[PDB]
Symmetry: D2
Subunit: 184 residues, 4 copies
């Protein structure tokens, strides 16, 4: 890319590939010790959870299982109660299992709270959450998140499975999507 | 069919076509009066609910909507908590809506109780139930069913959308499946 | 007279009489090997529930649910499957039971989809056929009624989720969209 | 050494090196028009997460979830779609990203199913290819590794839902089998 081209020199990287890897290595170990007697079913909500789940799972030295959900919005209902449409439910019964929801981000949205309560209605022994990223407004929802990768500022973030209009999920880092007019 | 052929002359009919139609007409009228101000979203769980839903809807003189779910078993989990796998969820937000689940049968299974609690977690104004049939072992499970077609004995029933190994759903009546050896 | 209905196109008794004829014809055509009735939600509900009961065979019934893929659906008929058939149709006779056929390409695509799943045969029974259905090259074996090019409601067919519970087929009144 | 694993077939570094080369080749081949990467759950998870990050283009990612239709799946490859693609692929380049290819007919049916949805093209990238994959006539443009006919686990691949989180591809030990 020529140096005369007017565009930002570096798109603003919030968490780089090595930082993510180091932190998931630590979380993996802590999770492996906490679940030593009874490995969890890792549950991920598509599509945001793809990278964190593939990576974190490989840092957990237990016989974990992996299962997925796909969800869509019910419009104004999703905003007010966190209810989502289940496009793809869990494949497996979680009755009497330890379940670990693995999230890309938590914030002031109510969908994680509603999903937690949904999975707790299915008889599991326990349901906990591991989230890569937490924003400041996550404090406004009353939920206990046992494992947190990083606190981040309130920015629109992309990469590491997070998109903007379906793009940028394949970035190996977490970046801030540019909002301002670039000037040379 | 020749008279020398060794086969029963009549299948044991529990509720005939006219009895179902007369009773659904009465349920329809009662439902229309109760929901005059705010018509319900009729919810049916496939495939059992097809005939009762098509028919009851047409006996309700209000602007109802209709929506559907499809579900499958999670094995032992379904027997112990009623939890089922959602294969197709509601298409519509039921936030602040009146919802009427229209059932083919109620019994000692926990799935209706779990489904009622699942829909109540999505912010509806109210969720009630209309069921065509109710067996004696439904008394075990504490749920309030506002509209009941018929209390029936404990028999394996078929017809009127109810199957045995996928068969007999298109009988216009509700019959008792025979398992005995026919003798001439 | 319903105020959202311009006029009744097909009354409850006409539908019932016609489905009784279709049912008998279908029962004769499939006497050796009953079909799997397939319906696409939600428009097929009434016709399927009523027709199935007029077919004196041991039919099975299965359902799909679909969403649009936007511009792709218009150009090829492809749809997004939100609920697939629950049962294998390999070596089965399948009878798609439709509410309406017209110039839309989703039926044609669906047919080609089901024929890619190994069935012995796939045929169509449609309650209603509009004039513009002639523009798509598909053979529909059973047809309830030819109707004119009107937006139709009732008997499971909706406008903006309403009127599916009318026991007849009506023409939607322009006062509901003007 | 893991006790359920008889031996390691492909180690973590080998998989990483190979996906780095595939990523580069893919990025050159699609430079003008990035692909929608399509993965079928759950086996494609690791290969898709990793390969996507080695492709320096603005790719998209979409997923499917499938079940068997029993005897029909064996004879034609047809599967029951539990979750379909979320996105229209009309006039798009598509790249199905697979965990294994072999004599099973499901990839062939899926390829033909996607080609019925109007895409500009559909190609396949597969991490692993077994010997019996020669028996199905499909053109697979990108192949990570040829492997022998073994039941393989790890790197997203399971046995009875276990071992998906191994960071290498192993051969399952017959003591578990
Ligand atoms: Mg510069
Ligand atoms: Mg998420
Ligand atoms: Mg039921
Ligand atoms: Mg239709
Ligand atoms: Mg419509
Ligand atoms: Mg695969």
């Amino acid at each position: 890319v020529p140096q005369t081209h007017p565009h930002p020199d570096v798109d603003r990287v919030l968490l780089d590939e090595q930082q993510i890897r180091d932190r998931l290595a630590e979380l993996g170990e802590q999770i492996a010790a906490d679940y030593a007697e009874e490995p969890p079913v890792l549950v991920g909500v598509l599509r945001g959870a793809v990278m964190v789940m593939a990576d974190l799972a490989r840092q957990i030295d237990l016989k974990v299982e992996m299962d997925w959900m796909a969800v869509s919005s019910y419009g104004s209902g999703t905003k007010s109660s966190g209810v989502v449409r289940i496009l793809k439910d869990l494949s497996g019964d979680i009755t009497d299992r330890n379940v670990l929801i693995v999230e890309d981000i938590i914030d002031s949205g109510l969908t994680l709270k509603w999903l937690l309560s949904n999975l707790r209605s299915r008889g599991p022994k326990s349901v906990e959450v591991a989230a890569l990223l937490r924003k400041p407004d996550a404090a406004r929802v009353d939920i206990d998140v046992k494992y947190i990768g990083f606190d981040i500022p309130s920015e629109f973030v992309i990469g590491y499975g997070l998109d903007y209009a379906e793009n940028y999920r394949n970035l190996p880092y977490v970046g801030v999507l540019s909002r301002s007019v670039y000037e040379d």
